[PDB]
Structures are given as structure tokens and as C-alpha cells.
Scaffold this active site. Structure first.
Site, PDB file in Angstrom:
ATOM      1  N   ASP A 144       0.827  -1.219   0.000  1.00  0.00           N
ATOM      2  CA  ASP A 144       0.000   0.000   0.000  1.00  0.00           C
ATOM      3  C   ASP A 144       0.861   1.270   0.000  1.00  0.00           C
ATOM      4  O   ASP A 144       0.493   2.277  -0.614  1.00  0.00           O
ATOM      5  CB  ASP A 144      -0.934   0.032   1.227  1.00  0.00           C
ATOM      6  CG  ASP A 144      -2.330  -0.534   0.961  1.00  0.00           C
ATOM      7  OD1 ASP A 144      -2.541  -1.248  -0.056  1.00  0.00           O
ATOM      8  OD2 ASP A 144      -3.229  -0.255   1.810  1.00  0.00           O
ATOM      9  N   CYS A 151      -2.434   0.717 -13.466  1.00  0.00           N
ATOM     10  CA  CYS A 151      -2.530   0.687 -12.015  1.00  0.00           C
ATOM     11  C   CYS A 151      -3.701   1.602 -11.657  1.00  0.00           C
ATOM     12  O   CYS A 151      -4.744   1.519 -12.290  1.00  0.00           O
ATOM     13  CB  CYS A 151      -1.201   1.098 -11.364  1.00  0.00           C
ATOM     14  SG  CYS A 151      -0.378   2.571 -12.151  1.00  0.00           S
ATOM     15  N   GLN A 161       6.641   7.897 -10.361  1.00  0.00           N
ATOM     16  CA  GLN A 161       6.014   8.959  -9.552  1.00  0.00           C
ATOM     17  C   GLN A 161       6.855   9.407  -8.367  1.00  0.00           C
ATOM     18  O   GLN A 161       6.552  10.458  -7.779  1.00  0.00           O
ATOM     19  CB  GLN A 161       4.640   8.491  -9.005  1.00  0.00           C
ATOM     20  CG  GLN A 161       3.501   8.522 -10.004  1.00  0.00           C
ATOM     21  CD  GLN A 161       2.186   8.004  -9.396  1.00  0.00           C
ATOM     22  OE1 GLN A 161       2.043   6.823  -9.092  1.00  0.00           O
ATOM     23  NE2 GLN A 161       1.241   8.896  -9.208  1.00  0.00           N
ATOM     24  N   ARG A 206       3.448   2.592 -10.867  1.00  0.00           N
ATOM     25  CA  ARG A 206       3.730   1.163 -11.052  1.00  0.00           C
ATOM     26  C   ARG A 206       3.755   0.775 -12.537  1.00  0.00           C
ATOM     27  O   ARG A 206       4.591  -0.030 -12.967  1.00  0.00           O
ATOM     28  CB  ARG A 206       2.677   0.325 -10.315  1.00  0.00           C
ATOM     29  CG  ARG A 206       2.686   0.543  -8.821  1.00  0.00           C
ATOM     30  CD  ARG A 206       1.516  -0.130  -8.162  1.00  0.00           C
ATOM     31  NE  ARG A 206       1.290   0.465  -6.857  1.00  0.00           N
ATOM     32  CZ  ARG A 206       0.322   0.104  -6.006  1.00  0.00           C
ATOM     33  NH1 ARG A 206      -0.539  -0.839  -6.354  1.00  0.00           N
ATOM     34  NH2 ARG A 206       0.215   0.710  -4.816  1.00  0.00           N
ATOM     35  N   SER A 207       2.816   1.308 -13.320  1.00  0.00           N
ATOM     36  CA  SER A 207       2.759   1.016 -14.754  1.00  0.00           C
ATOM     37  C   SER A 207       4.038   1.441 -15.460  1.00  0.00           C
ATOM     38  O   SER A 207       4.537   0.735 -16.350  1.00  0.00           O
ATOM     39  CB  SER A 207       1.554   1.726 -15.390  1.00  0.00           C
ATOM     40  OG  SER A 207       0.292   1.235 -14.909  1.00  0.00           O
TER      41      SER A 207
END
Ligand SMILES: Cc1cnc(NC(=O)CCC2CCCC2)s1
Length: 293
Positions: free
Chosen positions: A181, A215, A262, A221-222
Site C-alpha cells: 500500500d 494501475c 512517480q 507502477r505502470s
């Protein structure tokens, strides 16, 4: 510089945030006018994440052709990807329309439906064989065919039917279920094993349309997934693998979609994944096997 020693040099000097801010400063800026039209407000999950006009995927629909999705075309590596946001309640039909029209074989999902106690994406596929889904706005039917649940990921076989023409296709769904998370994984071993499973399925190969990867926003994440895949492919293709520059590849990918990677932690994790993954790609077979036990 090479990668593994540039890596140690950034760790010892604690300068990941400065490296990452340089990337943000150098990244391309292109218009995203269609994404910002008022009629498309409920088609965007986040107001600061939009596809560029020049690379956006267009739906084959004369009313409104807009979806928050981008084509990333990597010329030297000969690999293409569609990066998109997690579908919204009102865009699940658009999502599967895109899959159909772009001739994709595989869908890669890197988030859970609920994270940090909030919904990160709609439940856009069926959870039981006998309870299929019909998308009336785009005239598609989607059926769960099988499901294989593993410790770090789940693979599903899905059948997508175009109800206008009664054509059917098999879509593979690759769902990475264990990204934490907060932060990034401690070891890249399960992420790399997952990437190799996607590769082994045929989903990334030129005989199909581009894989769809998402994502929640479709950039973090992508971005890590396609950046690691493309860098490992280039290291196999070139005479000199140490000439692959992960920062230059990331800036090339950011010509096609804003904001990829990110955080400085995601940047460091991408380096780690390419470094460890190179060990198999250049000859030691058991490497995949250490990841698997
Ligand atoms: C719709 C969804 C429901 N659950 C989701 N994700 C998971 O369950 C994660 C798997 C964990 C627990 C079981 C083995 C590790 S997505």
C-alpha cells in the site's frame, strides 16, 4: 556511467531525490486539450493525469472517442504498450472497447481494487464463471474462463465477445496482487518473475496488438513495468549492454505519457529490477529459479 555502479554511487551519496527531480525538469510537455474538454471530466480519475493529444488512444466511435490511455511506442526495442488508468464505473465499457479495437492479447493490472481503504479502480472483470458481464453501451460480453491464484499474482483467462459480429477472442489477465500500500517492494524478485510470466504468455509479442497496462493512475507502477521490460530487451539486443541508460529510456517514454515513475523510490526500484534481471538475460538460468522459491 554503467548502471550498477551509478546505482551504488547514488546510494552512497543519497542523491535519489535530486536525480529524480532532474528527470521531472527535463521531461517533455505536450498539449492534452481533448482530455480537458468539459464533456470528458467524468472520464478522468485524476485531474493532473492526462494523455497527450498526439499519443492518445482513440475509441472508434463518432460521438465521443476519448479514453484516458496513451500509446508508448519504443522504436529501437521494437515494443509497444498502452498505458491507462484503472477503469471508472462509467468507463468499464470504453476499456473493453479499446482492448477489442486495438487487438490486444493481454491486460496487466498492478493494483488491488481497494487500497488504503479507498477504491482504486472498478471491478471490471467477472469473479465467477457462471456470472458473465454485459457492457451495453459498447455491446460486448465478457466471461471468466479460468483463474489461477498464486502467492504473488493471479492469472485469468477471459473470453471477450463482440455482440455486434459474434466474434470472440481470448484475453489473458495478469494481476500483480502484492505491491505494498505504501512504498515499493523490498526485493524485485517477485516483480521480475511476474514480468517473465507476462512475456512467456505471448502477450508482448508483435503478432498481437499492444499489451494494456494499468494501475490506479497509469503512470507509477505502470511506468516501472514498461521501463524495466524495455531496458532488459535493449540489453539483449545491443553489442554493448552497459550502454543502456535507464534515465534516457525513461525520458523517451515520457514523450508519450506524462509523469511515468512517480517517486524517487520507484526510480531506485526500477534500477534494482533491471540490475537483478540482467543476471538472467545475460546467461544464468537459475536466477529465475531463485526468484521462484
Ligand atoms: C477484487 C479483489 C479482491 N482481492 C484482491 N486482491 C487480493 O485479494 C490480494 C491477495 C492476497 C491475499 C490472498 C493471497 C495474498 S482484488
Amino acid at each position: 556511467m554503467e548502471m550498477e555502479k551509478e546505482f551504488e554511487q547514488i546510494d552512497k551519496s543519497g542523491s535519489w531525490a535530486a536525480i529524480y527531480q532532474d528527470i521531472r525538469h527535463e521531461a517533455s510537455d505536450f498539449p492534452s486539450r481533448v482530455a480537458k474538454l468539459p464533456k470528458n471530466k467524468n472520464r478522468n480519475r485524476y485531474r493532473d493525469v492526462s494523455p497527450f493529444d498526439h499519443s492518445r488512444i482513440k475509441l472508434h466511435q463518432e460521438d465521443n472517442d476519448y479514453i484516458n490511455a496513451s500509446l508508448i511506442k519504443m522504436e529501437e526495442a521494437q515494443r509497444s504498450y498502452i498505458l491507462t488508468q484503472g477503469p471508472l464505473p462509467n468507463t468499464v465499457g470504453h476499456f473493453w472497447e479499446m482492448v477489442w479495437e486495438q487487438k490486444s492479447r493481454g491486460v496487466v493490472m498492478l493494483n488491488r481494487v481497494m487500497e488504503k481503504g479507498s477504491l482504486k479502480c472498478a471491478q471490471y472483470w467477472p469473479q465467477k464463471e457462471e456470472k458473465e458481464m454485459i457492457f451495453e453501451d459498447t455491446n460486448l460480453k465478457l466471461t471468466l474462463i479460468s483463474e489461477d491464484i498464486k502467492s504473488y499474482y493471479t492469472v485469468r483467462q477471459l473470453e471477450l465477445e463482440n455482440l455486434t459480429t459474434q466474434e470472440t477472442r481470448e484475453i489473458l489477465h495478469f494481476h500483480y496482487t502484492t505491491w505494498p500500500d505504501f512504498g515499493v517492494p523490498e526485493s524485485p524478485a517477485s516483480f521480475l518473475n511476474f514480468l517473465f510470466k507476462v512475456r512467456e504468455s505471448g502477450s508482448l509479442s508483435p503478432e498481437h496488438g499492444p499489451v494494456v497496462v494499468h494501475c490506479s493512475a497509469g503512470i507509477g507502477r505502470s511506468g516501472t513495468f514498461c521501463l524495466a521490460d524495455t531496458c532488459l530487451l535493449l540489453m539483449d539486443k545491443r553489442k554493448d549492454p552497459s550502454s543502456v541508460d535507464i534515465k534516457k529510456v525513461l525520458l523517451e517514454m515520457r514523450k508519450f505519457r506524462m509523469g511515468l515513475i512517480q517517486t524517487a523510490d520507484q526510480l531506485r526500484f526500477s534500477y534494482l529490477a533491471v540490475i537483478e534481471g540482467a543476471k538472467f538475460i545475460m546467461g544464468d538460468s537459475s536466477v529465475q529459479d531463485q526468484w521462484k522459491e
